[PDB]
Amino acid sequence: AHIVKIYDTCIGCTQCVRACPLDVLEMVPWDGCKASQMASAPRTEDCVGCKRCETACPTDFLSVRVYLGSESTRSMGLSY
Amino acid sequence: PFVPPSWAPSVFVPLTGLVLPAIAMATLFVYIEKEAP
């Protein structure tokens, strides 16, 4: 399983969620920014680490990171 | 007092070319695939 962490510079623009091809990110209520939202990663056992969430983040140096870790049969994307 | 015999390459070469690789690879292959209880 990989390590996906959301940081506090998030502005809650939902770009990371629409870019995730595996549905491991979701938007939770929050009271720290104008949009009153913040991303969260409740299902990092389904993540494969494609790093589209990092590409979609607008704020400079990113508000979401994907640290690579120990692979499994789901995090390798093996269909056989 | 030490001398290896005249027939020594003939025996020791295929031993270390064929036998020890065979035992090594078979033993290691059983070791690799073992399941932890």
Binding site: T9, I11, C33, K34, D60, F61 | -
Partner: protein
């Protein structure tokens, strides 16, 4: 109240920012309880092609 006024030029001190030690222009300063209220534009773009970023109060200097 809380921040420098719009149109003014500021200087970034947040290190991980791509525009560290450079000059930007302020757009708006949020008055609410946001953690990062200062919206700064820049005339060049970072690697990702974005030219706008939020910053904290102490990380910008009127210069």
């Amino acid at each position: 109240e809380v921040g420098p006024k719009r149109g003014s030029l500021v200087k970034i001190l947040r290190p991980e920012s791509y525009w560290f030690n450079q000059v930007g222009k302020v757009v708006s300063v949020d008055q609410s309880g946001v953690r990062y209220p200062v919206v700064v534009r820049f005339e060049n773009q970072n690697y990702a092609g974005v030219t706008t970023n939020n910053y904290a109060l102490d990380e910008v200097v009127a210069a």
